[PDB]
Amino acid sequence: GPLGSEGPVTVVVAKNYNEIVLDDTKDVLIEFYAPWCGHCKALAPKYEELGALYAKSEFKDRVVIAKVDATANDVPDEIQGFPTIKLYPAGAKGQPVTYSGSRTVEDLIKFIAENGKYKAA
């Protein structure tokens, strides 16, 4: 049926991050960010290219690239390092892979691929 619309990576706010990023249906990579975070602005290229490929290649119904505004949405988890990249596997949604977030897609693949249960790589 219908496929595609706007923004590949599922930017799930803290409001739904427990419904989309915390879903055991697949491995979800949540990248906490902000609107003024120059870092996220550099991480988006990978989030749109990876997210798009993850949501439009051979895993669109599998490991999904998620995001959330750590400054626009009150998350239930604390963050000592802004931004952050938590990976909620499809089995370990209770002890995700909290991260700092870098500017590399290769590390992302190996991320949910070594951090993920689905091993999307």
Side-chain angles (χ1 to χ4, degrees):
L3 194 148
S5 27
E6 271 297 277
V9 46
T10 315
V11 186
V12 192
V13 285
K15 158 63 176 280
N16 349 287
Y17 130 85
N18 298 123
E19 232 249 50
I20 325 291
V21 172
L22 214 102
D23 217 18
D24 52 86
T25 57
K26 43 251 187 108
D27 293 17
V28 196
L29 206 293
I30 212 197
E31 176 238 322
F32 304 91
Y33 67 112
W36 53 19
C37 221
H39 279 112
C40 181
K41 308 298 126 142
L43 271 86
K46 77 236 273 272
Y47 244 54
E48 282 221 305
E49 280 206 22
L50 193 98
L53 296 161
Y54 268 56
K56 238 168 299 217
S57 302
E58 318 236 59
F59 327 89
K60 31 258 217 145
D61 278 298
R62 214 183 270 199
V63 49
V64 182
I65 305 314
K67 222 199 274 185
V68 67
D69 223 320
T71 174
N73 311 281
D74 281 284
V75 301
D77 262 284
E78 206 223 322
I79 307 179
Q80 171 261 279
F82 264 78
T84 293
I85 308 210
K86 278 176 151 177
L87 182 280
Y88 293 64
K93 236 113 238 282
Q95 183 222 90
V97 188
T98 175
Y99 243 85
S100 171
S102 215
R103 65 216 139 70
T104 185
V105 186
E106 322 231 66
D107 200 29
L108 272 180
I109 295 140
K110 255 258 195 258
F111 202 121
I112 322 105
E114 301 243 286
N115 287 281
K117 301 180 128 44
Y118 256 100
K119 326 309 202 320

